A = this chain, B = another copy of it.
Amino acid sequence: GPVDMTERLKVMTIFGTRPEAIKMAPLVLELQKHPEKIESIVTVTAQHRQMLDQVLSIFGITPDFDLNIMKDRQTLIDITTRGLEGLDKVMKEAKPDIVLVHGDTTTTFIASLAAFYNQIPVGHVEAGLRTWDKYSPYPEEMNRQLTGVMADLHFSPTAKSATNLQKENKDESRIFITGNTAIDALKTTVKETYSHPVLEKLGNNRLVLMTAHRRENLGEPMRNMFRAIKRLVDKHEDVQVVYPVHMNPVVRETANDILGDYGRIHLIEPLDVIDFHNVAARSYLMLTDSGGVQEEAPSLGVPVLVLRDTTERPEGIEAGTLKLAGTDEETIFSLADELLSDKEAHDKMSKASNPYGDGRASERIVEAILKHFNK
């Protein structure tokens, strides 16, 4: 009943961005369920500031350490050096027994590097996703490869991601298939009774929900996307597009330039994860280049056109929910037009399934970690 604090494994979770925070929040909550076995320490780089805080506030997570590294229009070098120097300091102070990193951000990479530089084991949550193209996604494909060679334990969401690691000669006895913790989060946010102003001003129109921020999509590719979206809106009078625009000033310039003040297109601030998941669940069609949206959509049964030349979510393609659209204006327009015009085409994409698991990934991760240390 009382908590004995005297014999605990120090587990440090490290992340710095909105998507990492959403996917790591369930894991933090799960670590906290084992207070006599685990001292759970949360460290954030704050590679993101506002969009990170948005997530921390929903889950009620106060970091033990916060490096506050974000700069305006920061470079990959800014994040790499500020993150590394700060994390090395945190690790020397707290001396964790294992560092847990997530996915494929630059934070993921330098968190892994800092752990290695202190000879601290690394557990890679969301391990083994691949496009095999180091310039798509850039720099995320490289971040998850780099992290891959540093990690001591690999928590693969799916059988294919496990296979990817096996094919790279990782230790088979260090690879575990858990499901994606995205689903752990999703099952607690979605809810039957829900309203939002976006959904108020819709009337009985069909909602197209969009997000766009991939680094390699900046500039020409996003302009192509946005012009296709205006043409869809021109053609389909009963559609409203809602775009919670990423905080990157570059994205915002392009968004404002092409879509600003256009009727039935609503550029809004980033939604918190409860609002976003619930609005997504109630959407007719999503247009996105987001990674997490690709894992969430199948469970919601909501068709998604992926606005990239690659994806590392092949399981959502196989589920029917996801379709790769590329970044060419005419091709995006054509594919989106067919889904908004042809109900049978839409029907093929709207069967709900759970290719990314049952929302119990976090339990499995904590178990694996304890067993690894014989704790």
Contacts and interface: CB of A to CB of B under 8 A. Distances in A.
A76 B167 contact: no
Contact of A84 (B81, B119, B138, B139): B81
Contact of A146 (B84, B88, B146): B146
Interface in A151-165: none
Interface string A95-138: 00000000000000000010011010000000000000011001
Contacts of A84: 77, 80-81
Interface string A147-186: 0111000000000000000011100000000000000000
B117 A139 contact: yes
A145 interface: yes
Contacts of A81: 81, 84-85
A280 interface: no
A142 interface: yes
Contact of A77 (B117, B139, B169): B117
A149 B145 contact: yes
Contacts of A77: 84-85, 88, 117
A81 B148 CA distance: 21
In the complex, the count of this chain's copies comes to: 2
- By size class, the interface of chain A is 20 to 34
Contacts of A134: 116, 150
A142 B139 CA distance: 19
Contacts of A135: 119
Contacts of A138: 119
Nearest to A134: B116
A165 B266 CA distance: 50
A219 to B, nearest CB: 14
Contacts of A119: 135, 138
A142 B113 CA distance: 10
A82 to B, nearest CB: 9
Contacts of A88: 77
A76 B149 contact: no
Contact of A149 (B80, B113, B146, B169): B146
A299 B142 CA distance: 38
17 contacts: A76-B117, A77-B85, A77-B88, A80-B84, A80-B113, A81-B81, A81-B85, A119-B135, A119-B138, A134-B150, A145-B149, A146-B146, A146-B149, A149-B149, A167-B169, A168-B168, A169-B169
Given A116-B139, A142-B150, A149-B149, 13 more contacts: A76-B117, A77-B88, A77-B117, A80-B84, A80-B113, A81-B81, A81-B85, A119-B135, A134-B150, A145-B149, A146-B146, A168-B168, A168-B169
Which are the 5 A-B pairs with shortest beta-carbon distances?
Answer: A145-B149, A81-B81, A167-B169, A168-B169, A76-B117
